[model samples]
Target: QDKSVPVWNGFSLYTDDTVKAAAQYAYDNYLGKPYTGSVESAPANFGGRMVYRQHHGLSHTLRTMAYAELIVEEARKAKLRGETLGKFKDGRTIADVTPQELKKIMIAQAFFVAGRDDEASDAKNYQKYHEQSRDAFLKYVKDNESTLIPDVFKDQEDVNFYARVIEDKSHDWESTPAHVLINQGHMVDLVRVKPPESFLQRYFSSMQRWIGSQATEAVFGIQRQFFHATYEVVAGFDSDNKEPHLVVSGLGRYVIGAPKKGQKEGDLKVFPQTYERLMRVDEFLKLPEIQNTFPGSGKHLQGGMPGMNEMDYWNRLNSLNRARCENDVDFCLKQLQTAHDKAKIEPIKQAFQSSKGKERRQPNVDEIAAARIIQQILANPDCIHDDHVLINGQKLEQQFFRDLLAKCEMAVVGSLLNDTDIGNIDTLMRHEKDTEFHSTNPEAVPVKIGEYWINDQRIITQKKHDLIFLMQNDAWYFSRVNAIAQNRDKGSTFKEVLITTLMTPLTSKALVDTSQPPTRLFRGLNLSEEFTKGLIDQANAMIANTTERLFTDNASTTTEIKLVKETWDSNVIFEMLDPDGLLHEFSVYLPEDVALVPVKVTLDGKTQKGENRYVFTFVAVKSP
Candidate 1:
């Protein structure tokens, strides 16, 4: 009883063996502390980015994967019963899955299981691991192009038309091996990633994620300053309804006011970065592009605020004058004590003091922003652009502003990724494969030699005038099967003339095929049996490469991260296997149900398989 296996319960019938196989791939190549043939350089870097994953680490991923597989199986059962297990956003349900979709999910979930990063002082890894996950998977697909992928596809439909292999009929139909291999590739593609500005065509491109915008401790604390400042000047017109955050956005927690009168916790906020973020808005207008492209456009874009042209000339004095207003507001304000007229200034202060809360003060942000701008402008003798800088024909307040905020906001709105941006992104990710692990550069470089396992090698005897289609420097051309560097256990740069190009079908004396570009083309045909099969295999490979390129190349961009959070029903079950060949059942119903009692493992903590052992005492609060 001490070391007994769980009773042969129904839980195993559904979770069965797929989870075991899925874990096998990720744990071998991607997990592990470190090893000889592993993809990530571990030991020195436990899981690279994976090391930081505490809550979403290995055990968590396995449990998640197990749930997904079980759901699919249940969905399959529902499919047979003409019912459904779950629903999708577009009014479709689980039973609506197709074979291709089925295959897609299998591979996607497994790889996504690997491509994740977590926190505990590791925030940077979180931002770009989406690209890392994508590129890593692409590299692996090229690596495993032949071996286990075809084993499942051998006798499956379209084998002859796609792979060119005649069914020798000795093909094994057992699905696990090929599933694992192909699933491995899908795993990378499905990794949890931050969504880009525009979705790339990767398997998980459409996966939606949510991000929380944080309000700083200072933002909360300074709500007192904000409460008074907003009330004194901004309490008349509706600022909150006009633009969600209005002052609080970029400036955080303004309208909402202090957190629970709770300055009781009284910790110093130091200089909040959000304040620095707002303060730097002025220099952005001085930058070449904004300086040049925006002035003429500001009138139309200034959201109905009057006096757009005035803010322009006053904008020039703004830089030095704003700086002059900083370090000691008194010296600067009284320097402006030289002012004779107080029409705008006195009225604003009077309006502010007399301002009463009515349906939550409708703060005129234009008046509020104007108050801040005019004081800084007048503090310098630059009142030459004086009343011209008036919003609604009146200046207000001691020191404040908005054009910089408006301009910086414009910069964000104009930020976009064109084709070149995408190309650089692709190039950068590809470059990381060459530099030290998880690093990148803009310039394109050759694939690192001798670092990867290339596909099976072969020599072909070409007869003169045998036409072949080829890809040369992104250009598709047909030529005689003319050049050979057969013994690549050698070298060539010039004149025994060797060209490395993509080899495809049908090249001739006068024709380079343009009917279809490799970028959008697929399928293949004959030679000898292996050659024919290789051609078929290459056809699929080319198509995969094409699919990836199509999906990964995108023109959208967004800066903040939106992390993936998969939600599932509360109660669930997963399985475990013991070294003595015993299978055990573990179920999750609530927080802290199981236990973890560490036991001895091999000294080689560099691997995932045998180096770690612990008891499954109980599961804790899941993120679901």
Candidate 2:
């Protein structure tokens, strides 16, 4: 009982002698820390980002378990061949040793296990130890590239590929010697190349399956801000016809693990038959509450409020599946102020209030009040089509506003990954390299030469490439959705608008001006006043052009809408609207136009991986 091995949450798991000593050591030494309440509370730093212990607890547990098993398996294999475990002075053969004894011996000889002293606090030793391991792995790859490189590939291509793979410098604390040698580049290449399935390919593929077992605390108190916002918005829309609860479900719980129906543990003998738990949102909320009352957590509520403990609990549960009515402005304001008081988040209160500058603060009480108004109107069954919805004192048609909301649901989630900041964060989490490290400018200062493992440039570039693919695919998906909606053959023209505003190049002032391109676009379309009013107006204008010129003068009833590329190489097509009626017949070049063609996988020369075999290809349109 005293020898129980500690797992995640500082919980202990009892094990028999069959388990290796290294596994026990890994638990006690590396994974022994109690799971912190949030990312800020966790002592570990991954790259530049802080990760909560619970977020990565299961992965570390599996990794340590796998490392231990690999040690035992390798030792047993050597014993079958009648070989010594290591270059020990003692005549201890693999057969003569117990699993724990052999595990310690192997770790000592190979130096695979990081020293207990290596930690996030001790940055020098931590980076030094990791660098040593990474370099050793790089050398191994370099030495074995001749045998590892597939024979089907050309000599130069193989050389470049090997070089590129070796250049990856990014690694995490969980990275193991087995991971570097068995997985990483070798298996990654095989999967990507997808050569004819041979025994060798099959074996590598099997190993690859096991290889891929892969939040701020502040603003963390306010991390609830985003979730709460989502909940409140969804709650406002809840009805008998629509179950908004389903939309709010993701916010309430996080899935830890699930059982396979009849799958065998097979070669990977870790998670067998049991050991899975679903973490509820209520349990997670307790984490912050516990920390708030700690010894160092003494800070009285600034604004007029009840007891600190009471307020903390109230904030945790408040806005959780609660809906405030359109007329309940006082309740909304009170809740917002209270949230700010408990969290000591000034920005929350500031966001709703007026700015010292001329520009309007977004999500201000007015904007939120407008959203509530829209929700209230949409929820009522009595509301008829073409009814004017007063948003920010401006009137918009009901159907147009409804279409705007639909566009929002599609665009918001669909292209969420397109935001550069979010894209960078996701890419970093995947343990890939970033692309900016590859600066090709002549004036650029080069990274210092060092006794290193891989090319720093390639490592960063690969990560950048991965990020690009994610963002581009998200954009393409958004475009696809737009096309699908357009293909509905509805008589009216619909334009999908971005509910959120983005920074544009033309905003010469402090990111805003009266005559900027965005302003002009809205003004030209007679939506200038409504556009600046709030997100509601902006979205309304985007979804339905209120002033589209219906061509009753011509006999043609239908015009074919073509999907064209947004750009052309070197040259650009700039279209100018004629201010005078005399210039109506002037020719305008479409230099950016391209034909969007759907191609099947067989004809496209691309690997068949997506759900559908067809992919949209952009073919440059020939100028007449």
Candidate 3:
């Protein structure tokens, strides 16, 4: 083949053996340089076999341009082996082509209208060659799908091979934007140009337009994000909803280069550090990466948290609560407080703890145990005790009192529980005047209620909040009215009403079968029509049916199963799932009721095979 003298900015060079030799030198001595690709003199990783030669004179040489030589060599080889160029396939040489193939085709294009090119060749000549080569290579790859990966290029110059490997199925290119953008730290220096309102607008107006257009012209056809751009502008950034990283910085080492300045210490930080903290809503209307349609992104703070621990705790609580209700339920004082403590944040714990003696007399033994449980919860995975709980993302020292109440309710109910019960509870007005001193007023204290009542101080706290008090009271009254108004004689109104309120540890939420007895398989002996809701539900129904039948034949009401907490180890949930596909999960946070046993109904009532009720208790919970 004739030597092709490709001129770069008028710096003429013969793109042949000499150029290849320079590339060979680079391949041989790159590691010796200070930077990975530089040719500076130094000992290299390859056992120091070759000597590094640093000559100032070479700085002006074409081959010595940091990465230009490598780019040229790869581009030519790609052309010879039939790679795509500007949409054209291999072996199809167009007379209109110029010598601008390597620089224009191989390298990523500059911003759409960032500035005019100041290179040597006129725009037309440079663009023609680049487009033809780019098109040709692309067509070649399209034709040779099978051999293109392995056989197209040599081992020493296997640019395509390496790229193909990197783009393999295991790697995900979609999320790379965020990864790159974040690494840049959104540093102030990096954002030289003024942003247009939000990141999305700025990215689209200043950055993405160029990216989108140039990408369209390359070997692989370009894909525009018209909808994406529009959507970002309309909707906004949403942390909860995960989408591809769109910010310019996210496209690897392209538009958004390395961190401009600051945050140089390599600490893993959150996103959007470059933007202003108190940016206006209109200003934040859209950022490239923002999911504007997401429900919660209008507020300024989205990426950061008060602390890691607090974040984790709220996340877990949110998970638990999510399983309870859909995305609707507004968090109340109690729920928020419970989430806070459950997250195990130290500041929260300390704040609550500082008042340990003041809150309720240093929490007695069980109370201390309850406090320890709270502390343990706070000390759990995500709780950086010092970290504040996040409210819309600004780390405030505000208290989530309800979060504390939930855990306290668990601890108190847990204390009374003996590993047998499976339900959640919220407290209400107790027979406090009835049994006050013996219980030390189950306020913040974790207590073992007698399968009937949950005695937490939040019951009173709820009453303090008229709205909350009425909600719980209404639920309790309806449950009791269902029992009593249905029957006139021996009014079980008070007991039924009280039992329904403290439903967490009180009502039968789940009847877990922790029987890993090493037996082959244990299944229902005979399914019972009467015990349809659950096995234990049938038994409890029957018990109530039988008991009520004496008073009045043909009892209409279903019998409620009483749960007694029983403590064990970590094998509870797994054991329940074993031997049967159905797992008995029962949680009654809505209308409070007693925690109960695993219900099973069989043909033979109370048979040894599948007619038994047992309470599987809480032990310890840790995420894997």
What are the models' TM-scores? 0.21, 0.16, 0.18
Error of 3 at 505 (Å): 16
> Please, what's the RMSD in Å of model 2?
32.1
Q: Which stretches of candidate 1 lie over 4 Å from their true place?
A: 1-22, 34-53, 73-91, 98-104, 113-127, 151-624
Best by TM-score: 1
- Candidate 1: deviation at residue 330, Å? 72
lDDT of 3 at 320: 29
Model 3 accuracy (lDDT, Cα) = 0.26
Ranking by lDDT: 2, 3, 1
lDDT of 3 by residue, 240-301 (tens): 33332322343211112234332322222244534423223332343334434322234332
Pitting candidate 1 against candidate 3, the one with the higher lDDT is: 3
Q: State the lDDT of candidate 1 residue by residue for 503-538, as single tens digits.
A: 111122112222220111101111233543333333
Write model 2 residue lDDT over 522-607, tens digit each, in one string.
00111222332333323222212111111110111111111111111101111122221112111222233221111101111122
Enumerate residue pairs that collide in model 2.
167-455, 433-463, 434-460, 435-460
- Candidate 3 vs. truth: CA RMSD? 27.0
Global lDDT scores for all candidate models: 0.26, 0.27, 0.26
